[PDB]
């Protein structure tokens, strides 16, 4: 259950000194990352989020208008062009405000939900770098909600539901919650936080979610809720965050005309469910011990022949599953069937279809799982239907288990 | 047909002084970008390419070894960390070779086609920047094919086929081809350049493709076949590029075991079809004058009620088309129906479905196209099926045209 070892055995990715903390995603590891994105996007559509994409660098001047330069200066990568300094973005927040600032906004537009899978970089100390868990280049399932204070509570409940919704898909049911409160050095009236923290606590209650407080550990711009997952070895992983922000929209001159024909500054919610996706893949790799559920498996099916006499039939079936949207590969090597099955099992390929003369004659396939299960012979289309259903529902378990 | 104006008009994207030559994709523009991406991926699958993701930056020492520092220094953004210098990548090739170098390779593994939607940055002179066509930050529909010298003919032919294939999807049939030869500043011997230039010249001749030389315009590492397409305004746009490289693999220590079990350096073919996603979207915007084919349209269908009477029916139908994979929006504003239809026509929404009391009891919808054509009352499932077919075939024309 070490993701670094598994990542090498399954040829998912690799790292090297020429790019500390920046993942070289191989075909198979990138397939998992892309399927995660597909999954998140399905939630974006469901919970009604826009998806945008911001540039990787912006003038040091704009970053200074946020405050990110005092708190993050030491973690930002800077570069330049024609005598102007630019910072490689360490977060997507400012960029999303720039998008909001384009076009007159009114209460009729709020709540405005803006998501993005945009890579960020932080010049983390090389010594603290570790596999997919602590990196310099990372992509969070980031989003920002611009709303009025009268919408906050409903928005937080929206994020709450999404959290448990996504976590349950990967089998994570044990979730600990912590609501960090007002720190000594903050930006806002004690009155403000009273309402802010109230919103967070009431929202957690409307969902019956026990929680503890991390007194004085909120950000200077607002209180927050963090969700910590527990994997099968009972290890905790903080991944979810719902951060209220009462100072960023103001510093970047964001505003809208309220129903009271006046000009107000929207409230900004920062939320991420999985957190760093590179890290999340590392957590799942260890949680599944490399046995990724079929919807995430780099290669879902390998079809193999006994002798080069079923080769033609194997290719035929490989095209069918492929056209069916299944990640399938044909193993026509000159190796014994047991050698092939052993290899694909070690690679954790969910299903293996064996094709001997018997299967060719009947137009069926002998089905086996990576768990050593004999699933009998099946018609090609029965297999395809069963697999599409397992993939579509993102089922954690295979056929028969 | 000014992509800059259309882009602001349809809320596709925007640029600002704090990040010159770098695009902010708004929801609708990003939707187009993502659909293009889905299209390219359908081709990567059909043409048998792997898809990977490399690091955003790599050690300057790596770039010195490739020759990029000596021949490409001016175009590169640099940054540092822990007394080390890093170049934000201007190209994806070196990263692809690093991935290639992980794990022993044999002739059995070739040709190995490795694609990436590579985020690249080139510090282009500010004065030469222009909308989406000339930018500093872009996304290349890049790939590198690692092959033997004997496979060069077939692999180059594959890239050539891929160029005409993809361009035809967008209605670009008039294509002019050119061969850019050895530049003043280059790496590799005159013998290697003679051979690489001849291989490409012969590939064009064998394909009976007339061409003209672009003397001294090759890449510092190899000659290239460049493809220029023409839009409906008979304007020329250079986009596609196929490059033959006998230098970078050797310099980056790439090798594979030949059939004669001898160690060999693989040949590397570089190719991008669209060039950059950004520029291609700029071209498409002018080509279609904002009237994006349905598969690309940000919002494919807008459903409108007349009065509150039909609000319930509209919500139901929208929910229904959305489940059918169609990008749909309901417009229940208390506005005259014509005002609504006008606004959406202005937005180039392919189809507008109007619902009056009649449609509601009828269980149908009144269909109008953004070109102002009246398609009459249609069964809801009939439109859904027809829209799905138009989207799936990536057709350039709407119902009735
Ligand atoms: C096409 C791509 O692979 C090449 N390196 C280029 O940027 O020109
Ligand atoms: Zn944020
Ligand atoms: Zn290249």
Q: Are A308 and A336 in contact (CB under 8 A)?
A: no
Q: Which residues of B are catalytic?
A: 93, 122, 140, 142, 144, 224, 270
Element (H, E) at A376: strand A374-379
Structure's resolution in angstroms: 2.0
Beta bridge partners, A244, equal: A269
Distance (Å, whole) CA A74 – CA A70:
8
Distance (Å, whole) CA A52 – CA B26:
5
Distance (Å, whole) CA A6 – CA A109:
46
Residues B307 and B252 in one domain: no
From the CA of B219, give the closest atom in ligand 1.
Answer: 8
User: Residue B249: helix, strand or coil by DSSP?
Assistant: helix
Which structure tokens are listed for A234? 């009972």
User: Given A45, A77, A137, which is nearest B81 (Cβ)?
Assistant: A77
Residues A113 and A28 in one domain: yes
Residues B284 and B315 in one domain: no
Beta bridge partners, B117, equal: B141
Residues B239 and B340 in one domain: no
Q: Are B374 and B368 in contact (CB under 8 A)?
A: yes
Distance (Å, whole) CA A132 – CA A280:
8
Residues B175 and B303 in one domain: no
CATH number of the domain within which B179 lies: 3.30.930.10
CATH number of the domain within which B302 lies: 3.40.50.800
Quote the ligand 3 centre to B93 CA distance (angstroms): 4
Domain boundary among B261, B289, B317: B289
Q: Are B3 and B132 in contact (CB under 8 A)?
A: yes
Note every long-range contact of B79-84, with CB atoms under 8 Å and residues 24 or more positions apart, other chains counting.
B79/A77, B79/A78, B79/A79, B79/A88, B81/A20, B81/A77, B81/A123, B81/A126, B82/A125, B82/A126, B84/B59, B84/B60
Phi-psi region of B314 (alpha: psi -120 to 50; beta: other; left: phi over 0): alpha
Residues A334 and A265 in one domain: no
Closest CA to A354 of A214, B187, A108, A344: A344
- Residue B52 structural domain: 1-289
Residues B321 and B204 in one domain: no
Distance (Å, whole) CA B44 – CA B115:
8
Distance (Å, whole) CA B214 – CA B159:
20
Domain boundary among B237, B265, B289: B289
Task: Report the domain count for chain A.
Answer: 2
Count CA atoms within 13 Å of residue B313 on its CB side: 21
Backbone angles phi, psi at B281, to 5 degrees: -65, -35
Distance (Å, whole) CA B161 – CA B154:
10
Contact A119 B88 (CB under 8 A): no
Residue B50: C-alpha distances to residues A6, B154, B170 (Å): 20, 18, 24
Residue B401 per-residue DSSP state: -
Give A33-81 as a DSSP string: HHHHHHHHHHHHHHTT-EE-B--SEEEHHHHHTTTHHHHHGGG--EEEE
Instruction: Find, in chain A, the residue whose alpha carbon is nearest to that of B125.
Output: A82
Distance (Å, whole) CA B111 – CA B267:
10
Residues 246..285 of A with a Cβ closer than 8 Å to B: which?
none
Residue B129 per-residue DSSP state: -
Contact B25 A52 (CB under 8 A): yes
User: Residue B204: helix, strand or coil by DSSP?
Assistant: helix
Residues A135 and A195 in one domain: yes
Residue A71: C-alpha distances to residues A76, A92, A219, B111 (Å): 10, 15, 11, 49
Distance (Å, whole) CA B171 – CA B231:
8
Residue B322 per-residue DSSP state: H
Distance (Å, whole) CA A238 – CA B376:
55
Distance (Å, whole) CA B227 – CA B162:
12
Distance (Å, whole) CA A110 – CA A89:
26
C-alpha distance across the termini of chain A, in Å: 21
Specify the pairing of strand B212-214 against strand B175-180: parallel
Residue A310: C-alpha distances to residues A30, A300, A329, A339 (Å): 32, 21, 15, 17
Residues B267 and B363 in one domain: no
Which structure tokens are listed for B266? 């693989």
Residues B145 and B250 in one domain: yes
Domain boundary among B264, B289, B314: B289
Q: How was this model experimentally determined?
A: X-ray
């Amino acid at each position: 259950r070490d993701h670094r070892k598994i990542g090498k055995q399954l040829d998912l990715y690799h790292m090297q000194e020429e790019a500390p903390g920046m993942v070289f995603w191989h075909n198979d590891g990138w397939t998992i990352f892309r399927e995660l994105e597909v999954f998140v996007r399905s939630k974006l559509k469901e919970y009604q989020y826009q998806e945008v994409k911001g540039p990787f660098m912006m003038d040091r001047v704009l970053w200074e208008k946020t405050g990110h330069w005092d708190n993050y200066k030491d973690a930002m990568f800077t570069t330049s062009s024609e005598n102007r300094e630019y910072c490689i973005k360490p977060m997507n927040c400012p960029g999303h405000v720039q998008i909001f600032n384009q076009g007159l906004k009114s209460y009729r537009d709020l709540p405005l939900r803006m998501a993005e899978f945009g890579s960020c970089h932080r010049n983390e100390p090389s010594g603290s770098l570790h596999g997919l868990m602590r990196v310099r280049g990372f992509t969070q399932d980031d989003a920002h909600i611009f709303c009025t204070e009268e919408q906050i509570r409903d928005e937080v409940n929206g994020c709450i539901r999404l959290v448990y919704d996504m976590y349950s898909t990967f089998g994570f049911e044990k979730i600990v919650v912590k609501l960090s409160t007002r720190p000594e050095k903050r930006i806002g009236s004690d009155e403000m936080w009273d309402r802010a923290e109230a919103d967070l606590a009431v929202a957690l209650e409307e969902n019956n979610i026990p929680f503890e407080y991390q007194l004085g550990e909120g950000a200077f711009y607002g209180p927050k809720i963090e969700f910590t997952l527990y994997d099968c070895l009972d290890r905790a992983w903080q991944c979810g965050t719902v951060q209220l922000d009462f100072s960023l929209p103001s510093r970047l001159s964001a505003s809208y005309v309220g129903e009271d024909n006046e000009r107000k500054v929207p409230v900004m919610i920062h939320r991420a469910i999985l957190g760093s996706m590179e890290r999340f893949i590392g957590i799942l790799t260890e949680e599944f011990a490399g046995f990724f559920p079929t919807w995430l498996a780099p290669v879902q099916v390998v079809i193999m022949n006994i002798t080069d006499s079923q080769s033609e039939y194997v290719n035929e079936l490989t095209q069918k599953l492929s056209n069916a949207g299944i990640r399938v590969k044909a193993d026509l090597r000159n190796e014994k069937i047991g050698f092939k099955i052993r290899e694909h099992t070690l690679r954790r390929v969910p299903y293996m279809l064996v094709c001997g003369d018997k299967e060719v004659e009947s137009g069926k396939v002998a089905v086996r799982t990576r768990r050593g299960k004999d699933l009998g012979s099946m018609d090609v289309n029965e297999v395809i239907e069963k697999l599409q259903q397992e993939i579509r529902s993102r089922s954690l378990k295979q056929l028969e288990e």
